[PDB]
Design a binder for this molecule. Structure first.
Ligand code: BNG
Length: 414
């Protein structure tokens, strides 16, 4: 009961934030698609990614071990809004370096929130429902992403100045400066809305009183240490395996979506990349639908069994995708996300549940494996080009899902 209301709030707050955030995702390109283009500095943007999803996690966890989950969530929510707030001004004065800075900051909020919010929800109540809790909250996440794209993308990209790069090319310098500014001007109000949303969320959390948790506690001082927590983590095996599992999931997932439109265009005559995007959309819908249903499953059933089931089906879909072509392989690929759905939350929960003190530090690592999303692309490109076509590369995701299934039948403990 006292575990329940905070939870429902977290869900709504997951949803809400999920809107403010993917809202930020729609607009950020515009800064870039307007001030096009550049070479070296582009790599600097990708670095925010590793920064936030590799560096910040462990420190974040340390913050948490020493303070708590709410502390980490708060600062994470704090980091995000600060970083998001930097954009508008960097734009309005055309200071890139400032933009880049806010980007790293918002990037840290992300790694911070990831490492914070996930273990928190699964611990937010009885041990069994840890998996269902995280999954359901993640559904509200997915759902929030749904909404922004819907009620938001249309009702917000119809106020931003469209421009054929050719017109931009033909502009005088004065004109270009004028354009760029009118552009950053149109987005700056929705950004205030965003930050506003992010803030209120942070607010509600401070207002919200949660019950205590054997994993937030401090009864240790020496053994509460990093390496103490760490040396203990090696055997645990299910944790060490979920780590490997999440690396693969992220690799798998980005392999699928990142290469999807290329697959479509090279596989189906005559696809425009414009039209292919439609399939990409369907994928996110499968993903949300996939999660809703999977969570209904996670409530009825042993999570690992659902995880294992889903891992197999997705791997199937991918083999089908790799060996089929035309529309048959496409649909299989785009339908695959319906089964990726449950995977990340379920992997995460099986992974920690249950680590107690080491829950925090264990999470820091699971988060870092998001680096796998980055490591896969070269391999996708490599295998793809080495083979002459996109589909044979789709064996790689499949290879991931396979591994993940092994974990599912290897999630066990005690
Ligand atoms: C009131 C508390 C609000 C806390 C919200 C924590 C959100 C954690 C969600 O994980 C993130 O979701 C993104 C999509 O929304 C993904 O793209 C990204 O990979 C992942 O890192």
């Amino acid at each position: 009961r006292s575990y329940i209301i905070p939870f429902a709030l977290l869900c709504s707050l997951f949803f809400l934030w999920a809107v403010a955030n993917n809202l930020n995702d729609i607009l950020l390109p515009q800064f870039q698609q307007a001030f096009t283009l550049t070479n070296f500095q582009a790599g600097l943007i990708q670095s925010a990614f590793y920064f936030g999803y590799f560096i910040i996690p462990i420190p974040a966890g340390i913050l948490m071990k020493k303070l708590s989950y709410k502390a980490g969530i708060i600062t994470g929510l704090f980091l995000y809004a600060l970083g998001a707030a930097l954009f508008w001004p960097a734009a309005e004065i055309m200071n890139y370096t400032l933009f880049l800075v806010g980007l790293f900051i918002i990037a840290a909020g992300l790694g911070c929130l990831e490492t914070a919010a996930n273990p928190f929800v699964t611990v937010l109540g009885p041990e069994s429902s840890g998996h269902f809790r995280l999954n359901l909250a993640q559904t509200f996440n997915s759902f929030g992403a749904i909404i922004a794209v819907v009620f938001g993308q249309s009702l917000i990209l119809s106020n931003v100045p469209h421009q054929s790069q050719d017109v931009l090319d033909k502009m005088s310098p004065e004109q270009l400066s004028a354009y760029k500014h009118s552009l950053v001007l149109s987005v700056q109000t929705p950004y205030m809305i965003i930050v506003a949303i992010v803030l209120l969320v942070a607010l509600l959390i401070m207002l919200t009183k949660f019950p205590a948790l054997q994993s937030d506690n401090h009864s240790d001082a020496k053994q509460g240490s990093f390496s103490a927590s760490l040396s203990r983590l090696a055997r645990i095996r299910h944790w060490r395996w979920a780590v490997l599992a999440q690396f693969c999931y992220v690799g798998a997932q980005t392999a699928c979506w990142s290469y999807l439109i290329r697959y479509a265009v090279e596989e189906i005559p005559g696809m425009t990349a414009g039209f292919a995007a439609n399939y990409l959309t369907g994928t996110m819908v499968c993903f949300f639908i996939g999660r809703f249903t999977g969570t209904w499953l996670i409530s009825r059933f042993a999570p690992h069994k659902v995880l294992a089931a889903y891992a197999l089906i997705a791997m199937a879909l991918c083999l089908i995708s790799a060996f089929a072509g035309g529309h048959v392989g496409l649909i299989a690929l785009t339908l695959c996300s319906a089964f990726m759905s449950i995977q990340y939350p379920t992997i995460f929960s099986l992974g920690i549940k249950n680590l107690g003190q080491d829950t925090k530090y264990g999470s820091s690592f699971i988060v870092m494996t998001i680096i796998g999303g980055g490591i896969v692309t070269p391999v996708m490109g490599f295998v793809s080009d080495a083979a002459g076509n996109i589909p044979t590369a789709e064996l790689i995701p499949a290879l991931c899902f396979a591994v993940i299934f092994i974990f599912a039948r290897f999630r066990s403990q005690t």
